[PDB]
Amino acid sequence: MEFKDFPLKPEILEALHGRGLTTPTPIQAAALPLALEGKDLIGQARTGTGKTLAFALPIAERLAPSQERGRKPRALVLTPTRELALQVASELTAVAPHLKVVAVYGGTGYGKQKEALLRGADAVVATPGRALDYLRQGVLDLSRVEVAVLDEADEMLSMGFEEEVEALLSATPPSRQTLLFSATLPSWAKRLAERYMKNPVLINVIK
């Protein structure tokens, strides 16, 4: 099946086509039918298998646009590094053109990021230390999050962000949809499924 065969808004498909993307990768073709229906899932696949779109397209499809100034984000994506936060934000901006995506990460001051969050955001893509910093400061508001994504959960474990991640997830509404992506599925990932997800289906691309 091609992207056009999936229940995706015309504007999203147009963006996909423009970016040279027509046919889902295996993780995408298996995950989208469930993720687009609002279901929780765990995606286990080598990096470069197309994991980002498997959660970006659900975020894009689920969220309607909003022009309301200072609005709080309706999606949160956590990633272990600044490099990945920038990459994921780029991709999500590109397939959710109707959404404002704000990236937050270390290696710079607070001022520009706070200014962005104050203006309003529909999705935030963040490293967990910086996100928790802003949560504590009152500038990142997670009370309206409808979709939470943990991207590379095993790297977030290996960089030591367990408490930050759990703290962030705990500040989101339990009504949310949660997607967890992790190449390996260590003990921590399993704890997260139990404690933060709703009967998620596991999709694992082997080889």
Added chain:
Amino acid sequence: MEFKDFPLKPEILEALHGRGLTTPTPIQAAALPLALEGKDLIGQARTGTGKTLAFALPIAERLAPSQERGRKPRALVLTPTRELALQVASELTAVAPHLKVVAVYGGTGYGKQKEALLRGADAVVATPGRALDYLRQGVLDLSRVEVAVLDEADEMLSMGFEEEVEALLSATPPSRQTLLFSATLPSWAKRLAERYMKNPVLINVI
């Protein structure tokens, strides 16, 4: 998503609708895009999940009819018991009435089944012991199999069919699509996935 969103022929859709079926179950929803494109999958699931239509629909869609006398089967489904073979064959006929489906199982005479295989078959749903007997005899020729399904692999393991199942898969062409259903993915199932499947996607709903 609805069944009509998937690349299924209108007669198939009409039949599902006739039975009140419009909305795929989780395992069907996740499996069908890949299964209908000929890709290998492992479904971690038991009865109650809708796993049967997850492999029956791709068979029904893939295989055109043929009236060729003596023709060899193009789909093989292995199951642990007579009971399940009868159930699966029934469901395969329900969605693919254009295909000759032959159930092969123990606890009965050879004659009927051997006759049917010699006359020609499009799909065979078999228990592994009797299937291997027919393979040995040349009665069951697997050289044209396009889809191989291992239904309830844990039960096949628990009954002692590991050797028969491996040998039957070893006799099909590696170009085939293989779909494996195993509730617990024991070590044997992992062995099968490595030896007999190609980059399988695992879908666990239980």
